[PDB]
Amino acid sequence: EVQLVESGGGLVQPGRSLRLSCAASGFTFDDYAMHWVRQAPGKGLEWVSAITWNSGHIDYADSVEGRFTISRDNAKNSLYLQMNSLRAEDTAVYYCAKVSYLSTASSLDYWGQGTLVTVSSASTKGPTVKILQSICDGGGHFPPTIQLLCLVSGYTPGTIQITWLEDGQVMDVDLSTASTTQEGELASTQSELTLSQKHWLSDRTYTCQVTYQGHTFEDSTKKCA
Amino acid sequence: DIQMTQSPSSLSASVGDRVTITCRASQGIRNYLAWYQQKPGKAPKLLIYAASTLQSGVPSRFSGSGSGTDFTLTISSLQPEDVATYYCQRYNRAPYTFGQGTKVEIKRTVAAPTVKILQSSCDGGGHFPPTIQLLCLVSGYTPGTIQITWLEDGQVMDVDLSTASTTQEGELASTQSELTLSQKHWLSDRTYTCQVTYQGHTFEDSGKKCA
Numbered sequence: 483e484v485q486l487v488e489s490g491g492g493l494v495q496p497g498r499s500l501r502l503s504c505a506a507s508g509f510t511f512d513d514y515a516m517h518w519v520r521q522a523p524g525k526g527l528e529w530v531s532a533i534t535w536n537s538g539h540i541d542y543a544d545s546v547e548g549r550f551t552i553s554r555d556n557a558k559n560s561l562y563l564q565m566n567s568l569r570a571e572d573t574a575v576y577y578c579a580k581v582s583y584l585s586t587a588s589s590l591d592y593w594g595q596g597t598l599v600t601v602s603s604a605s606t607k608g609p610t611v612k613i614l615q616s617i618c619d620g621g622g623h624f625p626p627t628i629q630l631l632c633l634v635s636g637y638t639p640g641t642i643q644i645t646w647l648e649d650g651q652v653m654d655v656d657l658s659t660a661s662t663t664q665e666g667e668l669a670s671t672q673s674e675l676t677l678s679q680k681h682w683l684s685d686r687t688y689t690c691q692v693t694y695q696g697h698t699f700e701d702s703t704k705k706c707a
Numbered sequence: 708d709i710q711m712t713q714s715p716s717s718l719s720a721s722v723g724d725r726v727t728i729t730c731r732a733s734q735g736i737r738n739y740l741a742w743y744q745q746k747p748g749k750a751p752k753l754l755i756y757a758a759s760t761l762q763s764g765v766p767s768r769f770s771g772s773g774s775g776t777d778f779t780l781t782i783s784s785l786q787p788e789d790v791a792t793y794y795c796q797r798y799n800r801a802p803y804t805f806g807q808g809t810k811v812e813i814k815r816t817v818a819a820p821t822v823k824i825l826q827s828s829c830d831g832g833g834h835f836p837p838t839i840q841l842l843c844l845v846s847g848y849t850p851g852t853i854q855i856t857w858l859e860d861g862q863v864m865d866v867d868l869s870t871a872s873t874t875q876e877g878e879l880a881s882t883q884s885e886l887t888l889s890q891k892h893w894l895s896d897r898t899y900t901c902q903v904t905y906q907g908h909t910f911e912d913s914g915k916k917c918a
Contacts, residue, residue: 541801617914660748
């Protein structure tokens, strides 16, 4: 399966630098053009930069030209974004993506799930994290499937990254859905993971991993003894 | 200056209705145009490329049209899983600009609220937490008076053991109630009911600790 995994996000002050990485697997990375695309909190997608398969042609959005440098290492199947001269409005989730065909004039068919970049001097209230789970019915039987609900609440309004881990491994993105509500003062997010019964009856340990303002908060659960 | 713009900003339709969304390129881009679908918290997914070619796996209700500067995306029969934000993108040459985005929602049908109980999880090592919380979630109902009552083996529980609260997000309300049990009380293995009374009708969910 194609996989793209971004890393390197974090909290930095304006004017500083940060380097993002994107580890590609499951396809011949060397043959394809790659892009970075970002999404500021509550905003639409913004294309950032493109690089061709052999690094011969590079392009940048006007908003980052002169400040960001895209590069790649085909021997390591990795894409990079060196972000310099950072500004508050560079705060976003940054995604790497692969083009469909052996042309830059093709659509972006595979995307990672992104890495969070916060450019700020402001301090913030971190989030509380807790996992809830399906109850059994009156007869003590499991529901058809087991829901784990990760509740992320009580943090200064801003972007949260939520990742589900199974025994430390990142889980399939399509196994969970997420929804957010904002009280005005504060935001709160619910991520719902759907597990089959056999899946839950394996004593695998599951982790709701939350990234916020440079740090990684988390809760974990396994089926009760 | 290169621009990609979309209309409308948002639309709402009933399940099964046709919805059409537009994309406008500031320069002619022939058919080098893609459409993507994005849900909350998730990366976008490619739906259509070359203006009208569906990506593998995309349902037959989706289609795209246009060549040059004006493009459309149509969902002929809007379904719950299509609720998302949609973006167009040019890929003829740099910049690989995305459009503003269009939110698509379903017009909510008059319907009873759902009621579900979740329980505290054990820790990573399988151990019970110091106290157990039951959380009754009542989701998706017209703002109004609502009353939540907890029962234990069918009998009313002390009102002090639970606390309720409501979030009004948009047109709908969601309410939840959290019941706190001592670990010893949870081990007694009784049956808990979250009973909800709303516009004169009562709905409920029940359960107990798994065997």
